[PDB]
């Protein structure tokens, strides 16, 4: 998909249809924010000398 | 026609004359006069029926022509420039649509024939009540794109702080409290709100905290309560000049409640609502006994009923009072340190208020054609007399350097102007007198008072300064016998300067009005004698004339030209009466213009039609002005100072009639020292010349008839958003979020099937909200603001077409996007979950359907009801900054042709670039040239597509399209 | 008006000692050093060696770069390392392209 469409936040669901499945169908959802860094840990250390 | 051309000219002049007369006349003899015109009108209509543009067409065209002539200068038919507000005044004065002239004339004569606790806290809009210090609310000189679009009105601090009362609760944002309220309940809520507003305004002004307030009622309290009542009236009516946060939702809800006609409701309950204010004022007696009628028994109405006018009057009063307080502070401090600090405070004040004054003047002057802002402000409120708004708010760059502080800087120690009677009977002010500079005098006349000697000295010095400036500028203006014409022009300006100093000036504009008012007390019928005494002995006459001569010396030295004989004369003649001097100036201007235009006729008569329009346009008002001059002359032909109605002496004319006095004054040639006028027609033919009867029998009224069809061009758009402006709406709407630099690579064979989709996939730069899964909250505010949010549909000339192609094509690509945009809203052919078969089309249907199926997306809001949008021109202008031609400005907005459902428009765009540029490359290796035949096979499938009117696609390019015939019909290797 | 003092591309820094005139009155003009740094957040420790650890610490001593532990790939320069490749049991060395965009033959 176009980057302007994925950054929009649309959710794409991968329906997989198979015989062995208990319900014969499974879904997985991927979103703009499915993989995100849950913890940003920055520590700025600003000095004046070496 | 034969013998009817004279009738047509007579009818035109007669129509203009009666129209002017009734406008001026707006008692026993009046009934005799009004029936005379009634009989004359019937006779003219009978003759016009024999003549036949239609009689109703001609009156409307005459109204619009007069407007475009006097209030708009140069009689240019630039209907494009006129804004939305002025159209209202024109359709009111000239009639809705066209061919309503008979009704407009009919109605004009008919008018002539008939001649407790609510949750509101104490007001803090102009400052918190003592012991409170801050909290001042500034004027909101901003407009809402969704509601009201372009509106120059500035919301007063008081209106922002209007006691909405129980109609509106601010808890967690803004939520209307009348979502489900009965009509009777709404009336009670508004009554309580008005009562509380009156009470809080009284306690705010009684403590003397309102800037206005700094009978026995608090100063300005009645003004404030009346204006709050007007604001309430416009809140219920829904006609608010500018919608504040609380204004919009309340207006919509009140419209819903009543219509489940609002004007009739308020016109019924206004008496009760004003009784609410009266009852509040009576209840004020508990504090101390006011009967309640102090602020007016009847509700405010009339010219003040207009909310823009009311807000502007409040601005004027508040600004004048603040200016007076700054005057007091500067005077006390100065008469370094505190004095300076106050001066910069005043400078900051004026700098802050300049934008507000400009916006409000622009709105008021345009909406009320003719009337001026300063006149309203000065006549309605006495406190504004001592302020010249034009001088204080001059836009000249050098002005700020000359007077950093403004009108209290002293305290901190050109040819197209029409002869106008404004600020004056029938006498008219020469353009030179209107140009007579008083700019440098005003700071001094402000600064100096109550002191005889200092007044004399400083007034004389600044009078010399203004005399030198006027000499310089007029000499440069008139001179590129020509000098001899300017000789008396210099003499006339000084000759006019005497009356302002004397106090006999006929013109009474703001400048001379204030000058005379202050001279009445500086040198003070004996007061007039006192001014003349300064004008007689030290002389001051010869001194200021020497200043005049020095000014012309400076001007001519700048021009490096010899000094003239006229100004080498030191002794001048006695001053003639002001009207006589103005009458001579008018006659001389008539000589010049008549000779020039008549020789232009003999030469030219191709733009002969423009010359005819120009000559007729110049001559027509001159007839009425000559009638006025003759009337005044016949009123003061033989009258002394006492006999004349005015307090001026006219005993030295000594001629039987005005045309006879024209003789022996213009008989010879211009002399400068004594003679200023010279016409070719010295004889008593001016009366016949003014009327278009005699001429040399040349028939030019046919062109005037050919000018009549311009009424067809006088079409009224009847919409609240204008695509002409100068730009106003362009600032409000923001860049689209999350759509990148579009048209990054387009018409470079990126075309692909999903019908051959052009680069409409990307050049459409919808905002994230519409294109994303999220629905929209309200169509009136988000789809509203998001479709315009695609101002980012302006990167064609912004980034890509800025220099890649000619300017026209960049705008042509926008035409493609607009129609594309239109078909996204209803049935395009993209087949994509974001553009077709998509939910964004459902985003529209969902929201309108939520509004009780008020209108289908394909019924209205189909890019038809609000087709205009910005037309993307703001984005075009945002980055490209290229002016759009008037013919180019109609395609980015709506046009009836839809270009057939994108099946043959996107096809239209293919050859416009994707084929013709490869063509010109071929005309500019041969394998690469032969590598341009793959578009020939791709022509086959699209030919099948169109095969599903004209026979095939080729003819469409040949005749529907303009740039297409350049392209080769078929490559075929 | 910007004077770009340093534009080191390894330790991305754009120190610009641009002078800014103060209000309308000079003689109190402010001088400002805008140290614009773009920390990569993803580049490896030994940036030319992809198999090296991740940079969890970024020293930006401005003294040294005013007058190397490279962090960010320069646009013009190509950073690359040899790679083993096996097709039918033959281990042949060949140069890689860690920044293919700017490493076209030029
Ligand atoms: C680890 O960093 C060092 C420098 O700090 C580099 O090692 C050498 O880099 C040069 C540059 O072309 C190569 O020619 C040498 O072959 C490298 N050393 C060895 C032992 O191969 C390099 O940036 C990193 N080392 C490696 C192996 O990638």
mmCIF file of N, CA and C in Angstrom, chain B residues 381-460:
data_model
loop_
_atom_site.group_PDB
_atom_site.id
_atom_site.type_symbol
_atom_site.label_atom_id
_atom_site.label_comp_id
_atom_site.label_asym_id
_atom_site.label_seq_id
_atom_site.Cartn_x
_atom_site.Cartn_y
_atom_site.Cartn_z
ATOM 1 N N UNK B 381 -20.825 60.232 18.571
ATOM 2 C CA UNK B 381 -20.196 60.378 19.881
ATOM 3 C C UNK B 381 -19.395 61.674 19.907
ATOM 4 N N UNK B 382 -19.742 62.645 20.758
ATOM 5 C CA UNK B 382 -18.975 63.903 20.772
ATOM 6 C C UNK B 382 -17.511 63.724 21.123
ATOM 7 N N UNK B 383 -17.156 62.674 21.862
ATOM 8 C CA UNK B 383 -15.778 62.503 22.304
ATOM 9 C C UNK B 383 -14.812 62.282 21.149
ATOM 10 N N UNK B 384 -15.312 61.961 19.959
ATOM 11 C CA UNK B 384 -14.467 61.689 18.805
ATOM 12 C C UNK B 384 -14.171 62.928 17.971
ATOM 13 N N UNK B 385 -14.648 64.103 18.384
ATOM 14 C CA UNK B 385 -14.460 65.303 17.575
ATOM 15 C C UNK B 385 -12.979 65.619 17.422
ATOM 16 N N UNK B 386 -12.221 65.509 18.503
ATOM 17 C CA UNK B 386 -10.811 65.892 18.500
ATOM 18 C C UNK B 386 -9.907 64.879 17.809
ATOM 19 N N UNK B 387 -10.404 63.885 17.075
ATOM 20 C CA UNK B 387 -9.566 62.869 16.453
ATOM 21 C C UNK B 387 -9.862 62.793 14.963
ATOM 22 N N UNK B 388 -8.808 62.833 14.149
ATOM 23 C CA UNK B 388 -8.906 62.607 12.709
ATOM 24 C C UNK B 388 -8.381 61.203 12.435
ATOM 25 N N UNK B 389 -9.300 60.263 12.215
ATOM 26 C CA UNK B 389 -8.908 58.863 12.090
ATOM 27 C C UNK B 389 -8.003 58.631 10.888
ATOM 28 N N UNK B 390 -8.280 59.285 9.760
ATOM 29 C CA UNK B 390 -7.425 59.110 8.592
ATOM 30 C C UNK B 390 -5.995 59.541 8.892
ATOM 31 N N UNK B 391 -5.828 60.678 9.572
ATOM 32 C CA UNK B 391 -4.487 61.136 9.916
ATOM 33 C C UNK B 391 -3.816 60.184 10.897
ATOM 34 N N UNK B 392 -4.554 59.723 11.909
ATOM 35 C CA UNK B 392 -3.960 58.844 12.910
ATOM 36 C C UNK B 392 -3.582 57.505 12.291
ATOM 37 N N UNK B 393 -4.378 57.022 11.342
ATOM 38 C CA UNK B 393 -4.200 55.703 10.745
ATOM 39 C C UNK B 393 -3.733 55.790 9.294
ATOM 40 N N UNK B 394 -2.849 56.739 8.997
ATOM 41 C CA UNK B 394 -2.277 56.827 7.661
ATOM 42 C C UNK B 394 -1.394 55.616 7.385
ATOM 43 N N UNK B 395 -1.524 55.064 6.182
ATOM 44 C CA UNK B 395 -0.766 53.889 5.776
ATOM 45 C C UNK B 395 0.543 54.235 5.079
ATOM 46 N N UNK B 396 0.841 55.518 4.888
ATOM 47 C CA UNK B 396 2.071 55.910 4.214
ATOM 48 C C UNK B 396 3.281 55.493 5.042
ATOM 49 N N UNK B 397 4.286 54.927 4.372
ATOM 50 C CA UNK B 397 5.477 54.461 5.076
ATOM 51 C C UNK B 397 6.229 55.632 5.695
ATOM 52 N N UNK B 398 6.435 56.704 4.927
ATOM 53 C CA UNK B 398 7.150 57.864 5.445
ATOM 54 C C UNK B 398 6.399 58.543 6.583
ATOM 55 N N UNK B 399 5.087 58.323 6.683
ATOM 56 C CA UNK B 399 4.314 58.934 7.758
ATOM 57 C C UNK B 399 4.806 58.484 9.127
ATOM 58 N N UNK B 400 5.078 57.188 9.287
ATOM 59 C CA UNK B 400 5.528 56.690 10.582
ATOM 60 C C UNK B 400 6.831 57.357 11.002
ATOM 61 N N UNK B 401 7.771 57.504 10.067
ATOM 62 C CA UNK B 401 9.010 58.206 10.378
ATOM 63 C C UNK B 401 8.746 59.671 10.705
ATOM 64 N N UNK B 402 7.859 60.320 9.947
ATOM 65 C CA UNK B 402 7.575 61.731 10.186
ATOM 66 C C UNK B 402 6.938 61.939 11.555
ATOM 67 N N UNK B 403 5.959 61.104 11.902
ATOM 68 C CA UNK B 403 5.251 61.180 13.181
ATOM 69 C C UNK B 403 5.246 59.801 13.823
ATOM 70 N N UNK B 404 6.319 59.437 14.529
ATOM 71 C CA UNK B 404 6.326 58.127 15.199
ATOM 72 C C UNK B 404 5.184 57.953 16.183
ATOM 73 N N UNK B 405 4.786 59.022 16.876
ATOM 74 C CA UNK B 405 3.764 58.900 17.908
ATOM 75 C C UNK B 405 2.358 59.106 17.359
ATOM 76 N N UNK B 406 2.208 59.909 16.302
ATOM 77 C CA UNK B 406 0.920 60.143 15.675
ATOM 78 C C UNK B 406 0.464 61.581 15.872
ATOM 79 N N UNK B 407 -0.841 61.746 16.103
ATOM 80 C CA UNK B 407 -1.411 63.080 16.243
ATOM 81 C C UNK B 407 -0.934 63.798 17.498
ATOM 82 N N UNK B 408 -0.293 63.090 18.426
ATOM 83 C CA UNK B 408 0.314 63.705 19.598
ATOM 84 C C UNK B 408 1.835 63.728 19.508
ATOM 85 N N UNK B 409 2.386 63.606 18.298
ATOM 86 C CA UNK B 409 3.824 63.766 18.126
ATOM 87 C C UNK B 409 4.263 65.168 18.528
ATOM 88 N N UNK B 410 3.490 66.183 18.136
ATOM 89 C CA UNK B 410 3.792 67.544 18.565
ATOM 90 C C UNK B 410 3.699 67.670 20.079
ATOM 91 N N UNK B 411 2.712 67.008 20.688
ATOM 92 C CA UNK B 411 2.616 67.001 22.144
ATOM 93 C C UNK B 411 3.867 66.379 22.749
ATOM 94 N N UNK B 412 4.456 65.403 22.057
ATOM 95 C CA UNK B 412 5.718 64.797 22.481
ATOM 96 C C UNK B 412 6.874 65.684 22.017
ATOM 97 N N UNK B 413 6.975 66.847 22.653
ATOM 98 C CA UNK B 413 8.016 67.815 22.326
ATOM 99 C C UNK B 413 9.278 67.549 23.138
ATOM 100 N N UNK B 414 -4.658 61.256 -8.026
ATOM 101 C CA UNK B 414 -4.367 62.643 -7.686
ATOM 102 C C UNK B 414 -5.024 63.604 -8.673
ATOM 103 N N UNK B 415 -5.433 63.081 -9.831
ATOM 104 C CA UNK B 415 -6.083 63.882 -10.860
ATOM 105 C C UNK B 415 -7.467 63.386 -11.243
ATOM 106 N N UNK B 416 -7.869 62.190 -10.818
ATOM 107 C CA UNK B 416 -9.166 61.633 -11.169
ATOM 108 C C UNK B 416 -10.244 61.958 -10.142
ATOM 109 N N UNK B 417 -9.925 62.754 -9.124
ATOM 110 C CA UNK B 417 -10.914 63.097 -8.112
ATOM 111 C C UNK B 417 -12.070 63.861 -8.744
ATOM 112 N N UNK B 418 -13.284 63.368 -8.523
ATOM 113 C CA UNK B 418 -14.471 63.998 -9.079
ATOM 114 C C UNK B 418 -14.893 65.182 -8.221
ATOM 115 N N UNK B 419 -15.420 66.214 -8.875
ATOM 116 C CA UNK B 419 -15.954 67.363 -8.160
ATOM 117 C C UNK B 419 -17.105 66.902 -7.278
ATOM 118 N N UNK B 420 -16.909 66.911 -5.963
ATOM 119 C CA UNK B 420 -17.872 66.353 -5.025
ATOM 120 C C UNK B 420 -18.427 67.437 -4.114
ATOM 121 N N UNK B 421 -19.711 67.307 -3.791
ATOM 122 C CA UNK B 421 -20.373 68.174 -2.828
ATOM 123 C C UNK B 421 -20.302 67.621 -1.413
ATOM 124 N N UNK B 422 -19.638 66.486 -1.216
ATOM 125 C CA UNK B 422 -19.560 65.890 0.106
ATOM 126 C C UNK B 422 -18.770 66.802 1.039
ATOM 127 N N UNK B 423 -19.174 66.816 2.306
ATOM 128 C CA UNK B 423 -18.630 67.730 3.309
ATOM 129 C C UNK B 423 -18.841 69.186 2.885
ATOM 130 N N UNK B 424 -20.114 69.550 2.783
ATOM 131 C CA UNK B 424 -20.492 70.914 2.439
ATOM 132 C C UNK B 424 -21.420 71.478 3.508
ATOM 133 N N UNK B 425 -28.301 74.308 -1.619
ATOM 134 C CA UNK B 425 -26.851 74.422 -1.714
ATOM 135 C C UNK B 425 -26.393 74.198 -3.155
ATOM 136 N N UNK B 426 -26.022 72.963 -3.488
ATOM 137 C CA UNK B 426 -25.623 72.628 -4.837
ATOM 138 C C UNK B 426 -24.197 72.982 -5.199
ATOM 139 N N UNK B 427 -23.433 73.571 -4.286
ATOM 140 C CA UNK B 427 -22.045 73.922 -4.565
ATOM 141 C C UNK B 427 -21.182 72.676 -4.424
ATOM 142 N N UNK B 428 -20.088 72.626 -5.181
ATOM 143 C CA UNK B 428 -19.217 71.462 -5.222
ATOM 144 C C UNK B 428 -17.778 71.863 -4.926
ATOM 145 N N UNK B 429 -17.059 70.960 -4.268
ATOM 146 C CA UNK B 429 -15.682 71.202 -3.844
ATOM 147 C C UNK B 429 -14.738 70.849 -4.989
ATOM 148 N N UNK B 430 -13.813 71.724 -5.378
ATOM 149 C CA UNK B 430 -12.858 71.365 -6.431
ATOM 150 C C UNK B 430 -11.950 70.237 -5.977
ATOM 151 N N UNK B 431 -11.428 69.429 -6.905
ATOM 152 C CA UNK B 431 -10.443 68.415 -6.501
ATOM 153 C C UNK B 431 -9.227 69.013 -5.827
ATOM 154 N N UNK B 432 -8.831 70.224 -6.221
ATOM 155 C CA UNK B 432 -7.680 70.863 -5.599
ATOM 156 C C UNK B 432 -7.931 71.124 -4.119
ATOM 157 N N UNK B 433 -9.122 71.621 -3.775
ATOM 158 C CA UNK B 433 -9.420 71.896 -2.374
ATOM 159 C C UNK B 433 -9.426 70.615 -1.551
ATOM 160 N N UNK B 434 -10.017 69.544 -2.083
ATOM 161 C CA UNK B 434 -9.945 68.255 -1.404
ATOM 162 C C UNK B 434 -8.496 67.839 -1.198
ATOM 163 N N UNK B 435 -7.633 68.178 -2.149
ATOM 164 C CA UNK B 435 -6.210 67.893 -2.061
ATOM 165 C C UNK B 435 -5.461 68.890 -1.186
ATOM 166 N N UNK B 436 -6.079 70.021 -0.842
ATOM 167 C CA UNK B 436 -5.417 71.044 -0.044
ATOM 168 C C UNK B 436 -4.935 70.442 1.271
ATOM 169 N N UNK B 437 -3.616 70.371 1.446
ATOM 170 C CA UNK B 437 -3.019 69.587 2.520
ATOM 171 C C UNK B 437 -3.181 70.296 3.860
ATOM 172 N N UNK B 438 -3.667 69.558 4.860
ATOM 173 C CA UNK B 438 -3.712 70.015 6.244
ATOM 174 C C UNK B 438 -2.950 69.082 7.176
ATOM 175 N N UNK B 439 -2.144 68.169 6.631
ATOM 176 C CA UNK B 439 -1.578 67.103 7.449
ATOM 177 C C UNK B 439 -0.656 67.655 8.529
ATOM 178 N N UNK B 440 0.263 68.548 8.159
ATOM 179 C CA UNK B 440 1.240 69.025 9.132
ATOM 180 C C UNK B 440 0.614 69.979 10.140
ATOM 181 N N UNK B 441 -0.507 70.612 9.790
ATOM 182 C CA UNK B 441 -1.134 71.561 10.705
ATOM 183 C C UNK B 441 -1.750 70.855 11.905
ATOM 184 N N UNK B 442 -2.307 69.663 11.694
ATOM 185 C CA UNK B 442 -3.129 69.041 12.728
ATOM 186 C C UNK B 442 -2.365 68.738 14.016
ATOM 187 N N UNK B 443 -1.138 68.201 13.993
ATOM 188 C CA UNK B 443 -0.422 68.017 15.268
ATOM 189 C C UNK B 443 -0.275 69.302 16.062
ATOM 190 N N UNK B 444 0.035 70.409 15.386
ATOM 191 C CA UNK B 444 0.234 71.679 16.075
ATOM 192 C C UNK B 444 -1.085 72.234 16.597
ATOM 193 N N UNK B 445 -2.133 72.221 15.772
ATOM 194 C CA UNK B 445 -3.422 72.721 16.244
ATOM 195 C C UNK B 445 -3.913 71.872 17.407
ATOM 196 N N UNK B 446 -3.474 70.613 17.480
ATOM 197 C CA UNK B 446 -3.739 69.803 18.665
ATOM 198 C C UNK B 446 -2.907 70.293 19.846
ATOM 199 N N UNK B 447 -1.615 70.542 19.618
ATOM 200 C CA UNK B 447 -0.700 70.801 20.728
ATOM 201 C C UNK B 447 -0.932 72.171 21.351
ATOM 202 N N UNK B 448 -1.154 73.193 20.532
ATOM 203 C CA UNK B 448 -1.177 74.574 20.996
ATOM 204 C C UNK B 448 -2.608 75.015 21.274
ATOM 205 N N UNK B 449 -2.835 75.549 22.472
ATOM 206 C CA UNK B 449 -4.135 76.093 22.835
ATOM 207 C C UNK B 449 -3.962 77.031 24.020
ATOM 208 N N UNK B 450 -4.924 77.940 24.172
ATOM 209 C CA UNK B 450 -5.063 78.844 25.310
ATOM 210 C C UNK B 450 -3.938 79.868 25.413
ATOM 211 N N UNK B 451 -3.014 79.918 24.456
ATOM 212 C CA UNK B 451 -1.916 80.865 24.504
ATOM 213 C C UNK B 451 -1.826 81.690 23.240
ATOM 214 N N UNK B 452 -1.978 83.007 23.374
ATOM 215 C CA UNK B 452 -2.094 83.858 22.196
ATOM 216 C C UNK B 452 -0.803 83.836 21.380
ATOM 217 N N UNK B 453 0.328 84.115 22.035
ATOM 218 C CA UNK B 453 1.582 84.315 21.311
ATOM 219 C C UNK B 453 2.151 82.995 20.795
ATOM 220 N N UNK B 454 2.151 81.954 21.630
ATOM 221 C CA UNK B 454 2.665 80.667 21.175
ATOM 222 C C UNK B 454 1.791 80.108 20.064
ATOM 223 N N UNK B 455 0.473 80.276 20.188
ATOM 224 C CA UNK B 455 -0.422 79.874 19.112
ATOM 225 C C UNK B 455 -0.060 80.588 17.819
ATOM 226 N N UNK B 456 0.053 81.921 17.862
ATOM 227 C CA UNK B 456 0.415 82.645 16.646
ATOM 228 C C UNK B 456 1.703 82.099 16.047
ATOM 229 N N UNK B 457 2.757 81.990 16.858
ATOM 230 C CA UNK B 457 4.065 81.623 16.324
ATOM 231 C C UNK B 457 4.044 80.229 15.706
ATOM 232 N N UNK B 458 3.576 79.234 16.464
ATOM 233 C CA UNK B 458 3.659 77.861 15.980
ATOM 234 C C UNK B 458 2.692 77.631 14.825
ATOM 235 N N UNK B 459 1.493 78.220 14.897
ATOM 236 C CA UNK B 459 0.549 78.110 13.797
ATOM 237 C C UNK B 459 1.118 78.735 12.534
ATOM 238 N N UNK B 460 1.778 79.889 12.656
ATOM 239 C CA UNK B 460 2.384 80.513 11.486
ATOM 240 C C UNK B 460 3.476 79.631 10.899
#
